[PDB]
Design a protein around this nucleic acid. Sequence first.
RNA 1: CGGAAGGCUCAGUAACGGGCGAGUAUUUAAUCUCUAGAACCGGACAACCUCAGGAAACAGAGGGGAAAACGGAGUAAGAGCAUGUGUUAGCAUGUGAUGAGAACAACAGUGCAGGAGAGUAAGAAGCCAUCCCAUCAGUUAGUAAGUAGGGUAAGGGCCUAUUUAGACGUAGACGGGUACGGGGGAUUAGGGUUUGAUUCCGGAGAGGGAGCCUGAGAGACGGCUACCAGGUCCAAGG
RNA 2: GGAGUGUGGAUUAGUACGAAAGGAAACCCACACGUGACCUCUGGUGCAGCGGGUGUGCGGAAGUGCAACUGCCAUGCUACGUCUCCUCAAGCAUAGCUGGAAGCCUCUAAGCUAGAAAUGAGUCCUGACUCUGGAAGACGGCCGGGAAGACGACCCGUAGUUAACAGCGGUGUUGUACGAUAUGAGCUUUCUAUUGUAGUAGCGAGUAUUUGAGACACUGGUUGUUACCACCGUCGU
RNA 3: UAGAAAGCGACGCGGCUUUUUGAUUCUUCGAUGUCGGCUCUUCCUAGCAUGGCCAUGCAGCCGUGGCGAAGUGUUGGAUUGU
RNA 4: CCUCGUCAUUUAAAUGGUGACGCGCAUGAAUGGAAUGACGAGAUUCCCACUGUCCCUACAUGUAGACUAGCGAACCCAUUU
RNA 5: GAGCCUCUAGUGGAUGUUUUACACAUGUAAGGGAAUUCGGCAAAAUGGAUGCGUAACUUCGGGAGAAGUAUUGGUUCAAUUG
Lengths: 229, 102
Amino acid sequence: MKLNISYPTNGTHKTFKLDFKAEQRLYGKKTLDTFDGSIIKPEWEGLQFQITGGSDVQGFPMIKTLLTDKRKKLLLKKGDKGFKPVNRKGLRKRKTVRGSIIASDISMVCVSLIDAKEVAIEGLTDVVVGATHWPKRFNKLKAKAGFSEDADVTAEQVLKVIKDAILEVNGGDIKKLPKLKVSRYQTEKQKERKAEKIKLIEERKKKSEKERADFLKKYPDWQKKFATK
Amino acid sequence: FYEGTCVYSGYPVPRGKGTYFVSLDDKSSLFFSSKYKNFSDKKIKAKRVKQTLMSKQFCGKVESVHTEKKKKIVVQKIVRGFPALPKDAVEKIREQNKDYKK
RNA sequence: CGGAAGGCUCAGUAACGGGCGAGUAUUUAAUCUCUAGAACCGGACAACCUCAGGAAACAGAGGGGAAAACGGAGUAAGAGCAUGUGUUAGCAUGUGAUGAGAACAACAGUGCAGGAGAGUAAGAAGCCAUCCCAUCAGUUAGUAAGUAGGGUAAGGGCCUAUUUAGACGUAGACGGGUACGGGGGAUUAGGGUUUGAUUCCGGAGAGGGAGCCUGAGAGACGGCUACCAGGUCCAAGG
RNA sequence: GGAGUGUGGAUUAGUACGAAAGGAAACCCACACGUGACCUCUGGUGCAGCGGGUGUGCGGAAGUGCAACUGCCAUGCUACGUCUCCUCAAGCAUAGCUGGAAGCCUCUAAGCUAGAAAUGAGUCCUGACUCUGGAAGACGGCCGGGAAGACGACCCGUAGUUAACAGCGGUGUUGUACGAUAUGAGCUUUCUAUUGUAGUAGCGAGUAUUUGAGACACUGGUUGUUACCACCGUCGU
RNA sequence: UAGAAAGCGACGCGGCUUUUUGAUUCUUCGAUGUCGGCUCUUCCUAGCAUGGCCAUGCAGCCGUGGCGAAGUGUUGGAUUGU
RNA sequence: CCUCGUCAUUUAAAUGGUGACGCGCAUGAAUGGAAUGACGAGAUUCCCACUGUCCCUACAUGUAGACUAGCGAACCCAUUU
RNA sequence: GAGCCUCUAGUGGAUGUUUUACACAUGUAAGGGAAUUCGGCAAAAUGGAUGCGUAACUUCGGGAGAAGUAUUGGUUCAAUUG
Ligand SMILES: [K+]
Ligand SMILES: [K+]
Ligand SMILES: [K+]
Ligand SMILES: [K+]
Ligand SMILES: [K+]
Ligand SMILES: [K+]
Ligand SMILES: [K+]
Ligand SMILES: [K+]
Ligand SMILES: [K+]
Ligand SMILES: [K+]
Ligand SMILES: [K+]
Ligand SMILES: [K+]
Ligand SMILES: [K+]
Ligand SMILES: [K+]
Ligand SMILES: [K+]
Ligand SMILES: [K+]
Ligand SMILES: [K+]
Ligand SMILES: [K+]
Ligand SMILES: [K+]
Ligand SMILES: [K+]
Ligand SMILES: [K+]
Ligand SMILES: [K+]
Ligand SMILES: [K+]
Ligand SMILES: [K+]
Ligand SMILES: [K+]
Ligand SMILES: [K+]
Ligand SMILES: [K+]
Ligand SMILES: [K+]
Ligand SMILES: [K+]
Ligand SMILES: [K+]
Ligand SMILES: [K+]
Ligand SMILES: [K+]
Ligand SMILES: [Mg+2]
Ligand SMILES: [Mg+2]
Ligand SMILES: [Mg+2]
Ligand SMILES: [Mg+2]
Ligand SMILES: [Mg+2]
Ligand SMILES: [Mg+2]
Ligand SMILES: [Mg+2]
Ligand SMILES: [Mg+2]
Ligand SMILES: [Mg+2]
Ligand SMILES: [Mg+2]
Ligand SMILES: [Mg+2]
Ligand SMILES: [Mg+2]
Ligand SMILES: [Mg+2]
Ligand SMILES: [Mg+2]
Ligand SMILES: [Mg+2]
Ligand SMILES: [Mg+2]
Ligand SMILES: [Mg+2]
Ligand SMILES: [Mg+2]
Ligand SMILES: [Mg+2]
Ligand SMILES: [Mg+2]
Ligand SMILES: [Mg+2]
Ligand SMILES: [Mg+2]
Ligand SMILES: [Mg+2]
């Protein structure tokens, strides 16, 4: 049996083999259970872990809401874990899955360490990493731009963030400089187009409203002439 | 050592007692005694037999898997971890930004 | 945005299966004409990154991140009900469930929200014509009708409750056997007798039966689900 | 008196032997029938114990009789369950050794060796006549029990981890007591004060809580209370 | 297949048994309950299986004729009173 | 009679049952002959359901029985067994 | 005026002992289901009412309750015999 450990403060991962006695002490648990590291290893006292998921040795996934030690077949839609539909909308299919309760069937258990405390777990504690992408949306970007509850042109914040990258990362360089872009804030091309719609409605009104009066000048007896079919 | 867990009663079965019953549907099932096998045949629903472990769990007299209502352990905010930007520099930029924002 | 068309066959069906008229008691993405739009906020899913399962087919954890994708806020709009007035649109008044919305590029354009009328396609209907056996004479009880309600896009025993006994037959009912139906084909002085799987139109099916999600539109099978009859690969667990 | 009997599989082996086709020979393991015991498990049985309903009795409820029906089930008994069953000695038929009669020959006339699920012993059940020991008292009845039992007989106890009743621990069987309280498909609109307001209800199968409750047994564990120290006969010194 | 005698053995001759049916009338007619089955025990050998051996027309497998041996075995059914 | 007649069907297996056949020891017409319905505590064969009849017996209840108080006979008898 | 239970009126003795085996009246039984026996002898199974649905043959009356199947308690309502 493998054990796969994630440390979400650091963004780091490690896999280990268990021994028999360690394994046998996990039996009976389920996803979203917790335990103390001392039950897996000597030391590791007070490290609290939470169980995330895993896999049958046949390869079927453990599902978070099927509380049994057995395999079932379920009918699954899009948005259900264990199924990945592609080429037709409204497709639903029947697949084998395993319940959440841990036993000798399992090949791998996934686990999250909540807090490393004073301990020095190799690989988990020795590295710190960030994200992969950058906040495109304006208000998400602003919070990261350190500001809150004040008004800027986007250019200001783009300048701040770029300069800080040049300074803090490279101390000067053309490296970094990912292609920062901003959504949900009005640029000048939008100011013009948003003015134009106001021009349209104002004329369409007057033109429509004119013809009504122009008609009534000529046809006082509109209704009595028209209605006699 | 146990033989297993009784299908109808929910009771754990000691080694060397009880029996398996195998149906033509191809399923094999373990019973504690003749008493509970017969109650299955006569279609008595287990939840109504008040001394069973099944009934006690269903009523909530005994804590069981359904009572637990677990949720994912909540974490806290981090110093903005973003690509390239080293963790320590953001610990500094965020402060500098907070200053300028005031 | 399309995969609901076209292609193949004639098993089932004596019937909305076929010919002629009519346009409703109905729904319709695209397309046309007229008209026609001041709106804020939030998370995820897939791919990406780090581990990593399974014999394969096929899947996991953890963390970012978009939309004209999605969910909420206000706001226009707004079904039904009731009374006036104009059949009947419309308008007035009272009451209100519900409740949104796309821009982008300049090679100089392409899109998307609402209405009203067209246009295309279905659903349901009117009339008339349809094979053999009497060694098959009585058949039917949602059957025939009425009142009221549910259901549907919509009329209706379509379905249900209480009342009335009807409906159809020797001018062949009911049962059984047999059949894709026309435009047409072969023979022919005339009157006839025989055939139509088969370039066009319309119907039904996808091994046999039954259920279904998505969509403007399928009871779809080069979509899904279960049984019955048969098969294929395996490391025997799928 | 008497007790174990037989079948199959694997291995030798596709071997010897045969032209080929075919095709043998211990030890070990599984089983059947027979024999003798045993309840740990699994069936069966329901006398003690707990529950349920039908008809009719004790004014209602609760506790219950009679006619009998029905679900579970201690201890016990039982098989459809579990355990059980070989070794010596003398020698049959036969095949041999030495060897005369009968200078040769020859299992036989003397003598010797190998020899059968058969015979005789031991291990197994019954137990004649005996043998060794202790002591002036011994033994029987009467009283109370069972592991024993038709009655006798056998195994045991009588001032004590003795008996019986209670607590408090322990181990089981049944299935959630009485009474309260809340709810309940529906059906209904009563009363007091007093003019008009306020007060203001009934009837109902069942279900949930209090409640793994209540009932019932056994304890070679431990505390309290209560009862029991006799008597009669026979043989001996 | 040669050959009396592995196995057979014509035509004749001598015995044993009481399990078949006869033959006879000794005992019982002031009464010995009459066929078959069911149940249960013991005995006999003229040996079907199981153990030890001898002959063979015994290669092996399967057999056939004989010797000492009676310890343990020899079943479930259909028609029929049998 | 021969005789458990021969052929078909019913069973794994039929001295049985039913259907055929007929020189019938020794069938047969009010000494009444032949084919059916309804009804038999009448005789016979088979199928479904059901079961301690059986394989193969086990446990439990009531009443007698054993032992004890009160009461108290008969059949039979050459008898030494 | 069946069986079962009660009111009026009427009623009872060979003693004590938990009591083996074999009996006589009765209960229940795993898996199998007539293998039992001359022979299903004895026992088990079916059972009332309401509805649906009912063959050969027949003297046309019958067969016929043919066979084969389903329903049934308590409570609270509608409707008036369905
Ligand atoms: K796609
Ligand atoms: K029982
Ligand atoms: K594998
Ligand atoms: K036992
Ligand atoms: K028992
Ligand atoms: K009484
Ligand atoms: K038992
Ligand atoms: K010897
Ligand atoms: K002896
Ligand atoms: K003495
Ligand atoms: K005594
Ligand atoms: K109670
Ligand atoms: K309770
Ligand atoms: K006589
Ligand atoms: K007789
Ligand atoms: K022999
Ligand atoms: K013998
Ligand atoms: K015969
Ligand atoms: K026959
Ligand atoms: K005659
Ligand atoms: K005659
Ligand atoms: K005559
Ligand atoms: K009779
Ligand atoms: K008794
Ligand atoms: K007595
Ligand atoms: K009376
Ligand atoms: K009566
Ligand atoms: K029989
Ligand atoms: K017979
Ligand atoms: K009899
Ligand atoms: K007639
Ligand atoms: K009949
Ligand atoms: Mg087509
Ligand atoms: Mg073709
Ligand atoms: Mg056809
Ligand atoms: Mg929106
Ligand atoms: Mg109706
Ligand atoms: Mg055609
Ligand atoms: Mg189709
Ligand atoms: Mg289909
Ligand atoms: Mg297709
Ligand atoms: Mg009892
Ligand atoms: Mg004591
Ligand atoms: Mg004799
Ligand atoms: Mg006599
Ligand atoms: Mg005499
Ligand atoms: Mg006599
Ligand atoms: Mg002899
Ligand atoms: Mg017979
Ligand atoms: Mg005959
Ligand atoms: Mg005559
Ligand atoms: Mg039985
Ligand atoms: Mg049974
Ligand atoms: Mg017999
Ligand atoms: Mg009888």
